[PDB]
């Protein structure tokens, strides 16, 4: 009967996978969690957010817990052709490794903007993240710099585009042309 | 420099109540996300005409507890140095800088705020050195840190704080390794 | 509140104002004692050069206070000697006992009259 | 404290600096100790003109004297820093490769910039040496020759660049201090340390000093208070031979209060732990 | 669970007055170090009888 009534609760409020799948990395003292979307969710029309929620079973006490959300668009071989929108959140770790362990839950929230009825908030619970100190002590989720250069899980790349501080500059030469940039980037900065 | 000397003369001499320059310190309780924290408004006031131009600064330093202890703790004190921008006659500015329990309940309390001025000529033009004028030594007691939530004016339903449970490092140590009211009194002659 | 004591003063007790502080935490007592005492230091040194001074008994109760202080003094000195030797039970009962001495000392501390 | 140059920064914002004192004994094995003060601060708000100058002001204040008499300010030189200077190293400590610490200002910039956490360790029914193995074989430490009480872990894992110290007073009991680059590493370190120790090895965090030292402090404070009150009563008792001057009672109660504030200080330090 | 289902049903229903659970926010101004900051207080008020015991966040 308890099961029956869980499912009844769930169905009372409410099919197409709005979200692929979840991933998480630890950078240094930050936890970054990110989720890769699907065609159905159009960030043109819907502001989306994400949150992390601690199991209160562990947390006998209540601090707040804060999360900043980036969207990351990357075009895939523009040189149809797939864009990739993923949605990501970043938070402090050390407040959450009180109990050697924790189990957050990930909630993708969605709010439409055109309709002033506030109508369509399709919450979605996308997985569930466990960490422990026993795991990090064996690496396995860390991103650690150098030698760990050859990034072959693309999540690791989406973590640095989520955790790191971003600034965007427009460059305008009124009196030359601009082909120095790739040279600066490849020779002076030695970029791959 | 002339302005600086008239000002310094105004400040040091005239052992009266109203100095030309002053620095009143209050204390306050604010909410940071959910926590309570202690705040120090430091309010610098200029009751004189002396618009203290460039090369004046304001040096606050906050010593938590003054005693010699073996193990050396991470924060003897904290210091701030706002540049003062001519400050102008009759004007005043206000500086809130928090003191609060930065650890889990980690708050030893004789915390003292001190405000000082500092003048350097080398800034404008040299030829170096400088002069440190002491303005206030304020202290913050424990009689200031009380807030009396029950007797308070509003009588509004606030959750009781119940500060953090023993230490989040304590919790770590329990997991990884698994009474009368005290009173004191004084009497004194009426 | 006011608490008059005739067996301390010869004629005029004074109907002296006592100040108490009560709390769950002993540490917060250490603090609010530090604070009250500091402000009574302030008051006494501020009032002196203006205020007069009461006469005392000289007798019976200052000597009783001497005796009940001296017992604790010699006991704490013995405890210091034990902590210097460092035989066994390094320091557990020692702190609890030092705080028992503190509690015993603090309750009538410094009746200023 | 640190003062920026106004002529540079037209815009007034604040500035911060955390003062950490560092005592390191040099070959205690008098024998020169080293006390050095250090402040710490954010770069990126200052480098907003590519170059900045900061005066360095060192205040000294007395405790004993409640008159605020002595404010021996000092102005200890002047620091200039430009973005060309950084572009060519010249000041940086950047890890790997600049490992063999042989400019002790490098050690001290570590001990200052790194989060600090102290821990007392006790093994009541077992002598305690396994710390020196956990340090010398597990973490793969390098001892700094100049200061042989400090250990820099070179194990190229996740805790790369963490410093300990280890005073093994009374070889049951010991005390271990952890300088780290965040608190995730400090938990990753405690976990690994607890793993190695015996089953009975009881850890403890220390906020404000070692239990033995704080007991000695409490003892000293009570001793001075009781001696001073015996002095009060002896002043009365010689006046018993000579009804008492209330002036004397006040004069002595002042000094008694002045010692009591210290006994109450030692008492709060003891009674929190 | 029952309490949960009762709260749930009350919030989605239209009471014609949203008063099982309410939350006001209110904007203010504080002071940090040098700069004025803008803060939102978020007050959670329980009007109805239902107790939100463990499990809500």
Swiss-Prot record, chain A:
Its main location: nucleus. It is found in: Nucleus. It comes from the Eukaryota. One of its GO terms (biological process) is replication-born double-strand break repair via sister chromatid exchange. Transmembrane segments: none annotated. GO terms for cellular component: chromatin; cytosol; Fanconi anaemia nuclear complex; nucleoplasm. The keyword Transmembrane helix does not apply. Keywords: Acetylation, DNA damage, DNA repair, Fanconi anemia, Nucleus. The keyword Acetylation applies. DNA repair protein required for FANCD2 ubiquitination. It is linked to Fanconi anemia complementation group B: A disorder affecting all bone marrow elements and resulting in anemia, leukopenia and thrombopenia. It is associated with cardiac, renal and limb malformations, dermal pigmentary changes, and a predisposition to the development of malignancies. At the cellular level it is associated with hypersensitivity to DNA-damaging agents, chromosomal instability (increased chromosome breakage) and defective DNA repair. Some severe FANCB cases manifest features of VACTERL syndrome with hydrocephalus. Belongs to the multisubunit FA complex composed of FANCA, FANCB, FANCC, FANCE, FANCF, FANCG, FANCL/PHF9 and FANCM. The complex is not found in FA patients. This is Fanconi anemia group B protein. The chain holds residues 418 to 683 of 859 of the full protein.
UniProtKB/Swiss-Prot annotation, chain B:
The keyword Nucleus applies. This is Fanconi anemia core complex-associated protein 100. The lineage of its organism: Eukaryota, Metazoa, Chordata, Craniata, Vertebrata. Signal peptide: none annotated. One of its GO terms (cellular component) is nucleoplasm. The modification Phosphoserine is found at residue 160. Keywords: DNA damage, DNA repair, DNA-binding, Nucleus, Phosphoprotein. The gene is FAAP100. One of its GO terms (biological process) is interstrand cross-link repair. Plays a role in Fanconi anemia-associated DNA damage response network. Regulates FANCD2 monoubiquitination and the stability of the FA core complex. Induces chromosomal instability as well as hypersensitivity to DNA cross-linking agents, when repressed. GO terms for molecular function: DNA binding. It comes from Homo sapiens (Human). It is found in: Nucleus. The keyword DNA repair applies.
UniProtKB/Swiss-Prot annotation, chain C:
It is found in: Nucleus. It comes from Homo sapiens (Human). The chain holds residues 769 to 881 of 881 of the full protein. Disulfide bonds: none annotated. Belongs to the multisubunit FA complex composed of FANCA, FANCB, FANCC, FANCE, FANCF, FANCG, FANCL/PHF9, FANCM, FAAP24 and FAAP100. Forms a subcomplex with FANCB and FANCL. Plays a role in Fanconi anemia-associated DNA damage response network. Regulates FANCD2 monoubiquitination and the stability of the FA core complex. Induces chromosomal instability as well as hypersensitivity to DNA cross-linking agents, when repressed. This is Fanconi anemia core complex-associated protein 100.
Swiss-Prot record, chain D:
GO terms for biological process: interstrand cross-link repair; negative regulation of double-strand break repair via homologous recombination; positive regulation of double-strand break repair via homologous recombination; replication-born double-strand break repair via sister chromatid exchange. Keywords: Acetylation, DNA damage, DNA repair, Fanconi anemia, Nucleus. GO terms for cellular component: chromatin; cytosol; Fanconi anaemia nuclear complex; nucleoplasm. Disulfide bonds: none annotated. It is found in: Nucleus. Its main location: nucleus. DNA repair protein required for FANCD2 ubiquitination. Belongs to the multisubunit FA complex composed of FANCA, FANCB, FANCC, FANCE, FANCF, FANCG, FANCL/PHF9 and FANCM. The complex is not found in FA patients. It is linked to Fanconi anemia complementation group B: A disorder affecting all bone marrow elements and resulting in anemia, leukopenia and thrombopenia. It is associated with cardiac, renal and limb malformations, dermal pigmentary changes, and a predisposition to the development of malignancies. At the cellular level it is associated with hypersensitivity to DNA-damaging agents, chromosomal instability (increased chromosome breakage) and defective DNA repair. Some severe FANCB cases manifest features of VACTERL syndrome with hydrocephalus. This is Fanconi anemia group B protein. It comes from Homo sapiens (Human). The chain holds residues 507 to 859 of 859 of the full protein.
